[PDB]
Amino acid sequence: GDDRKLMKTQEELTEIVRDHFSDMGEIATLYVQVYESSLESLVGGVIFEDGRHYTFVYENEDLVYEEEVL
C-alpha cells in the first residue's frame, strides 16, 4: 500500500541546474518559468552577465540547451 513516493522540489530541480552552470560560468539571473511539482523537470533558460541567453531543459537525464534566437 504505496503512498510514500517522495519527489524533487522547486529547490532541488533549480539546485541541479544552478549547481551545473555554476561550473561553466557566471549567471546574471536564474529563475524558473515552469516548475513541475508533479514530475522532475526544469526550464527557464539562464542569463549570463556577458550577454549569453541560453534555453535549458533538464528532462530526466537529457540536459538539453541551446541559444535563445527567435
Q: 42: burial class by Cβ within 10 Å (0-12, 13-18, 19+)?
A: buried
Residue tagged 508533479 (cell numbers): 38
Q: Where are the domains of the chain?
A: 1-70
CB 55 within 8 A of CB 43: yes
Cα separations (Å) of 10 from 36, 40, 43, 56? Answer: 8, 9, 11, 16
Report the C-alpha gap between 6 and 38 in whole angstroms. Answer: 10
Query: For the chain, give me the number of helices (H) and strands (E)?
Result: 1, 6
Cα separations (Å) of 6 from 13, 47, 66? Answer: 14, 31, 31
Report the C-alpha gap between 30 and 45 in whole angstroms. Answer: 8
Q: How was this structure determined?
A: NMR
The listed CATH number (1.10.3720.10, 3.10.450.400, 3.40.50.720, 3.30.390.10) that belongs to domain 1-70: 3.10.450.400
Write the single-letter amino acid at 10. Answer: Q
